[PDB]
Amino acid sequence: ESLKAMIAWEWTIEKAREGEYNPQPPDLSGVTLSRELQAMAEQLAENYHNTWGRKKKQELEAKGGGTHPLLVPYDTLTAKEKARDREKAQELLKFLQMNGYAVTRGLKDMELDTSSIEKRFAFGFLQQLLRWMDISQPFIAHIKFFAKILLPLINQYFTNHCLYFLSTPAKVLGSGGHASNKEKEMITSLFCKLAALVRHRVSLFGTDAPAVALLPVLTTLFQHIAQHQFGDDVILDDVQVCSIYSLGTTKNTYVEKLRPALGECLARLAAAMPVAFLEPQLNEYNACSVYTTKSPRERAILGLPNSVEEMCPDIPVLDRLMADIGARYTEMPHVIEITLPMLCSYLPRWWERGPEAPPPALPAGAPPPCTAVTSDHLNSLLGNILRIIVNNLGIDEATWMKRLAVFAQPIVSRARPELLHSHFIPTIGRLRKRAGKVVAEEEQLRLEAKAEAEEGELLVRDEFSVLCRDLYALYPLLIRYVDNNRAHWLTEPNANAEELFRMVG
Amino acid sequence: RFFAICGLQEGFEPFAINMQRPVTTWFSKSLPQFEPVPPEHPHYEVARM
């Protein structure tokens, strides 16, 4: 019955002939077990499973059903199968080894897409994603498929936010591949309108991207140019002034642009379009026909120190001979980059006026110079960051005035309180400025003292007046104190230990 | 080397402060000397038959 079942099932029979003392045996288990041979052997074991289970099912329906406690699935099959069925199997293997017979089956390999099962289901998700976008983009730009796309949104968000270390040790090249294809289908999903939000899913997927350079094969090298053209379109329109092309894209631009450490991709759209996004920010120093910004400083801080994997601007901009045709970057502009930083350096020398009125939009413009161009080659050129830090201290001497902008200034203080070798001890000017901040805190203390003393015996609504004085005193004080307790007491205490004169004030 | 940060103003004390000699500083062996059966052992238990 078994052999006739093979002959009915397997129509694979080969044509062999026409019509008619003590050899020392070596070991046979020296070579490893591949996926193909174990697939074939477990296929023979699975054929034994299916045949014996079909015969058992025939017995079950033959004897009027009846309880069968051996009816347990393949996983909880006891050791009797894996012992005795494999005994009979290997007996058959050594039987067919002699007198010339064998049967072969197989196709598999552990890889980055197909038959490595985690990547198998990741690729199934990517395939269903691309197929679903291909289905739905005409049906977006005019069902059950609406639900069918609603649920894997949350599935991909959960599995990618949960697993982040899947990417960096483990893959051959799908870390670029599947991620960039998912990003491709996200960006063609972008302007096409859906109800449920995905931008957090896109943000965590972008967080999965850094944790190589081969993605011309992927669309991602071209997707960067797509998003740059989108940014130029929308920044020009907003300079003059739409379905989804609004400020919602800037959060994904933030999380994708924020790649300070693992700027791995080479894409090389380096200087032109980022500078093309820079100049609206200076044009947006005034209103200039713009509904009010949302992330001016956050969109400005995306400038890393020429960190598309490593670039540097103004030579291939103004020298298109070998750059655009033939590159001219990462070693050429030893001083060509630093001409506009030197222009920026002069403004803090001028900002001595009190209020936020002279710096309206400078809260977004000043910080990214301090962050990025300082940060590179700090061991080589520390006087630049020193001048920048003391200039920011002088500019926050404007913030020493009691009330400038409680919304912008502490947000920017959190945006850039950083110091490496700039404090009271690196800079005794910073010590005198800390003494000035102590005098400012004494002004706040006298103010709160007068307000509290006036609060006695039902003078006025102290929650409206004395409290509001304390609020406006505390919040910029919270910004300054967060900078202080962040890193001003990072090097002060070692000097206060070594001598007395570090923090006498 | 340091002791200028966290304890000198803060109660924490040098360990061998008021001594005239150091500690013995016991250490760990490598040779396997015999030792009697602890009766508390997980899975090695005897019986004086």
Reduced to 3 states, what is the DSSP secondary structure of residue A283?
Answer: helix
Nearest CA to A494 among B27, B6, B35, B47?
Answer: B6
Half-sphere exposure of A353 (CA within 13 A, CB side): 8
Reduced to 3 states, what is the DSSP secondary structure of residue A394?
Answer: helix
Instruction: Chain B: give the shortest CA distance to residue A497, in Å.
Output: 6
Whether chain A has a CB inside 8 Å of the CB on B17: the answer is no
Q: Is A171 exposed, middle or buried (0-12, 13-18, 19+ CB in 10 A)?
A: buried
Nearest CA to A211 among A271, A270, A284, A261?
Answer: A261
Other Cβ atoms within 10 Å of A246 Cβ, number: 14
CA distances from A301 to A63, A223, A296 (A): 77, 22, 9
Give the phi and the psi of residue B26 in degrees, each rounded to 5.
-55, 155
Cβ A155 vs Cβ A99: under 8 Å: no
Cβ A342 vs Cβ A300: under 8 Å: no
Q: What angle do CA A102, A103, A106 make, to 5 degrees?
A: 135
Amino acid at A385: I
Q: What angle do CA B7, B9, B10 make, to 5 degrees?
A: 55
CB within 8 Å of A213: residues ≥ 6 apart: A264, A265, A266, A309
Whether chain A has a CB inside 8 Å of the CB on B49: the answer is no
Whether chain A has a CB inside 8 Å of the CB on B4: the answer is yes
Method: cryo-EM
> What is the token pair recorded at A309?
């994997």
Which pairs with CB-CB distance under 8 Å and at least 24 residues apart come from A311-315? A311/A268, A311/A270, A311/A271, A312/A270, A312/A271, A312/A336, A312/A337, A313/A270, A313/A271, A313/A274, A313/A275, A313/A337, A314/A271, A314/A339
Half-sphere exposure of B23 (CA within 13 A, CB side): 7
- Computed on alpha carbons and rounded to an integer, the radius of gyration of chain A in Å comes to 35
In the 8-state DSSP scheme, what is residue A426? T
> What is the token pair recorded at A505?
């004030």
| Helix, strand, coil share (%) of chain B residues, nearest 5 | 0, 0, 100
> Chain B partners of A502 at a C-beta cutoff of 8 Å?
none
Query: Which residues of chain A approach chain B closer than 8 Å at the C-beta?
Result: 493-494, 497-498
CA distances from A224 to A127, A252, A266 (A): 22, 13, 11
CA distances from A200 to A157, A186, A228, A380 (A): 8, 12, 20, 39
Nearest CA to A362 among A302, A297, A413?
Answer: A297
Cβ A479 vs Cβ A414: under 8 Å: yes
> Chain B partners of A494 at a C-beta cutoff of 8 Å?
4-5
Nearest CA to A118 among A157, A159, A148, A154?
Answer: A159
Q: Å resolution of this model?
A: 3.5
Taking CA atoms, what residue in B is nearest to A493?
A: B5
Taking CA atoms, what residue in A is nearest to B3?
A: A497
State the helix-helix crossing angle for A117-140 and A174-191, rounded to 10 degrees.
20
Q: Do A498 and B5 touch (CB under 8 A)?
A: no
Q: Which residue is it, tokens 């960039």?
A: A180
Cβ A302 vs Cβ A227: under 8 Å: no
In the 8-state DSSP scheme, what is residue A216? S
CA distance A252 to A204: 9
Q: What angle do CA A469, A470, A474 make, to 5 degrees?
A: 120
Q: Is A373 exposed, middle or buried (0-12, 13-18, 19+ CB in 10 A)?
A: buried
Cβ A137 vs Cβ A192: under 8 Å: yes
Cβ A300 vs Cβ A367: under 8 Å: yes
Cβ-Cβ pairs closer than 8 A, A with B, add up to 6
